[PDB]
């Protein structure tokens, strides 16, 4: 849970950056922040699989 | 307040003045407020009286 | 179960908050536009000193 | 009007959306069922034997 | 909207179940957690035997 609660919440902000980019559809910065959360999830995903 | 202004309607619409001693007419008058009577409203929405 | 329900909840206050932000700018602005609307009527009403 | 023809739509509900903007053409080009049609002559007429 | 929604999960037993990723994961993880509860309790009996 130390990482599980943290990683679901990390996934939660992955989801939240969407809300922010939805609220800021123009700025790439919000994308950039959002993008990192995206592969941040995938990174962990590949981390666990291995 | 907007309804109040319509309830006064600054001008008085009478018809019958023109450039000095030319054109001109009289009397197609309608009601309205006391602006042309000698009262003045400044663009700040406040009144002055002559 | 509550991680989802709460963390989703967290965004909503955040999202609703910013939505409320632009709204008051709109609401006060709309009054300003209506304030303007009056000002438009006054000058033509001023022009009514035919 | 060259803005979008629709209100700004954003999600707020148990899966519902909330409008919070106005696409100008409604203000500029839509209509009020409160109002009717009237029609005019352009001339205004006296007796003319005089 | 997807944040609310449930997606339907093709489990290769042939089933396809409509779930949030969260609940899947939860039942996935909770399954694992309960395994220790069973596993360790099963031991709990066993060291009793060991004694």
From TrEMBL, chain C:
* Source organism superkingdom: Bacteria
Q: Which residues cross the membrane?
A: none
Localization terms from the record: Secreted; Bacterial flagellum
Family per record: Belongs to the bacterial flagellin family.
What is the documented function of this protein?
Flagellin is the subunit protein which polymerizes to form the filaments of bacterial flagella.
**What name does this protein carry?**
Flagellin
* Organism encoding this protein: Campylobacter jejuni
Covered residues of the complete protein? 51 to 100 of 750
UniProtKB/TrEMBL annotation, chain E:
Compartments where found: Bacterial flagellum; Secreted
Q: Give the organism, scientific name.
A: Campylobacter jejuni
Per its record, how is this protein called by name? Flagellar hook-associated protein 1
Per its UniProt entry, which superkingdom is the organism in?
A: Bacteria
Parent-protein start and end of this portion: 508 to 558 of 608
Q: What's the family?
A: Belongs to the flagella basal body rod proteins family.
